[PDB]
């Protein structure tokens, strides 16, 4: 029906067919992501005898994805029990913060490795290519500071919203208002998408015009740059387009009738799982590749 949130008249339902498809999806995600991220972190922690900036950034990406998919199982249980998150108040804040901060970190580090590749390919002699490991550590800590600085507001709020008989633990909710959460999601998709697309296009154009693509290994690198672009789009475009659609019908129509939302809600959360695929799809493209 129509619920109520302070200063925000919201309406989010508990429709079925969300506990039969989403829990198995999240189970597969957690299994594969935990396995891949553990087998990736094993090399970095123990049997990697070198480092440098690019491996620093890949290690940070793996750390972010690892924390994300260890955060997954509680969210999986929350989906299983049909929005009945019966853990408390601190667990809600922690899980929402973990999910959002780790997604921001994954996206920011994807963008930064794309920019690193763009500098390494189009401007090989730029001073940013020759960057010290301490400088890389400072830059990565600064990036983590930027990531956290936009997300601590999920710790101040009372996340476990009690309504009717249920305890909602969802940061993504639809309300007749604009908050920094939705806007941050919008830029989270758009601006890194623009940077990644520009970097990939410039890399491809410079490599092809240099006519060095004839090498049997450059072709694999090009196809994996393309692959990383397409997987980024595949995991991030659906949820964002559903958010744009719900913004459109919220602006045009409003919240007078709450029954024009059901569909645009349900698939939304399903699309919301697509980005978690990135966590379980990053190891195959980023680390396990490039022999
Ligand atoms: O941040 C997320 O991905 C999220 C937020 C609320 C509910 N489910 C997932």
Residue numbers in the entry: 9 to 299
Provide the authors' own sentences about this structure as they appear in the paper:
Hydroxycarboxylic acid receptors (HCAR1, HCAR2, and HCAR3) transduce Gi/o signaling upon biding to molecules such as lactic acid, butyric acid and 3-hydroxyoctanoic acid, which are associated with lipolytic and atherogenic activity, and neuroinflammation. Here we report three cryo-EM structures of the human HCAR2–Gi signaling complex, each bound with different ligands: niacin, acipimox or GSK256073. The ligand binding pocket lies deeply buried within the HCAR2 structure, surrounded by TM2, TM3 and TM7, with ECL2 acting as a lid for the orthosteric binding site. A distinct hairpin loop at the HCAR2 N-terminus and extra-cellular loop 2 (ECL2) completely enclose the ligand.
HCAR2 responds to niacin (nicotinic acid, also known as vitamin B3) as well as other ketone body-containing metabolites such as beta-hydroxybutyrate (BHB). Niacin and acipimox closely resemble each other and make similar interactions with the protein, principally a salt bridge between R1113.36 and the ligand carboxyl group. Niacin forms a hydrogen bond with the side-chain of Y872.64 through its nitrogen atom within the ring. W91ECL1 presses against the ligands, helping to hold them in a stable pose. Other interactions between HCAR2 and the small molecule ligands include hydrophobic contact with L832.60, L1073.32, S17845.51, L2807.39 and Y2847.43; F180ECL2 and (to a lesser extent) F2777.36 form stacking interactions with the ligands. In the NanoBiT assay, the N862.63Y, Y872.64A, W91ECL1S, L1073.32F, N1103.35A, S17845.51A, F2777.36A and Y2847.43A mutants showed marked decreases in Gi activity and β-arrestin1 recruitment; R1113.36A and F180ECL2A lost Gi activity and β-arrestin1 recruitment completely. The side-chain of N862.63 lies about 5 Å from bound niacin, and makes a hydrogen bond with the carbonyl of C177ECL2. The niacin complex gives Root Mean Square Deviation (RMSD) values of only 0.59 Å or 0.79 Å for all 291 Cα atoms with the acipimox and GSK256073 complexes respectively. The presence of P168ECL2 and a beta hairpin loop further reduce the flexibility of ECL2. These structural features isolate the ligand binding pocket of HCAR2 from external solvent, unlike most class A GPCRs. For structural studies, we used an N-terminally BRIL-fused HCAR2 construct.
